[PDB]
DNA sequence: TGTCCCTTTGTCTCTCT
DNA sequence: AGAGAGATAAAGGGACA
């Protein structure tokens, strides 16, 4: 017979007993745990399902799932029940912070290292506990913490990095490798190539890590001589999303794209410069002539779809759904291009196809409103929240559908809608803001933390804002959100 | 196999002018 | 607002006992 047959059975046997109390996990949850944490993780959840739910820890099932769904999830669960009260009472961490640290592969290692190193990192090195939590909250957190402890002096002193930059480099997966590589390659990339320490930090952080830095070192000349790129444009490729893979693939595909399709290097860099750039470039070389045939899409439209994180997925989804959305939903190609030209375009596209008729018929929105909501990053999230929350926001809070669509139509619209739902009563009833003022604050990117900042100030007034009226705070929040408020706090 | 650590890619949210 | 930066997740490889 088959090996895993015994294992899979034990899996299902215990998995079915977890749909009961006190956890009640759905199929999705149960699979996710099975997939990343394994059988033993599923058993551990079961075996420790009462100790984690109730007194003292009182963790949500969602939080138990978060901790369980990684390699060694069994170990993280055991370690959490042991160290969560230690870390909260002895180091002043929130339980949310502890879960954050535990919710990665090798979670046990990270928790124990935090317990062992947070004192010395704050006292001897002057890091905040927040910074320590951030370093610890990725796979290999233990390694990143040990490496920060060890190289913070030499990085700040012999290499001129601020502690902030060091923390920023460290707070990624492979943090250890990024730090060690930055130590070695900073002088090389600085003195030999005219990059600033800042630019090096950017290559090292955000995923690029060691591979991006070594690939910038290796390939920067081959790119700025023959291919005639600026260092600026090389840094941009390696920086965000990037990195190594995008850089290697820009060498391969820069001519093929220009020569045969007539894209500028400018356009190529923009496609290159996201997470999965390599994938994006490739799908473009492959798919562009297919999208622009039969008087179809324009090059510039193909370039714009491609130039966001997951561009490959948006491209393939566009190629696949362009017909059905135009034919059976009445959308113009231009609209479809707008929906797709943001991070997660694939998701927004699929969610528009799925929910446009529902939001139109059941909720009385226009197709234009649905497109506008979809045409932002996280478009799927905003669309699903509008569907869920429109009736309550309108019926229970007095908002117009127009107002709800306005809150929804920015990056993080989901967060903004959920927060207006939470805080509208206390802002208006308890502090006398008008609904329109609330809607205004919330109708920007970052509407959620703008709203929270406002509530903080009116419920636990910082003296440093008291010279401003509600109306002035409101104007400030609309103008530049939380950052503006916090910047005022400093004055 | 279970665990730890690293890399790539995709998605979502917020910032900075 | 449009571009950059930061957060978080998902999934696979290497390594080791
Ligand atoms: Mg982008």
UniProtKB/TrEMBL annotation:
Extent of the signal sequence: none
Keywords, comma-separated and alphabetical: Host nucleus, Repeat, Secreted
Compartments reported by the entry: Host nucleus; Secreted
Keyword DNA-binding attributed: no
Gene behind the chain: hax3
Complete-protein stretch covered: 231 to 720 of 960
Keyword Transferase on entry: no
Protein's name in the database: Hax3
Any GO CC annotation of this UniProt entry: extracellular region
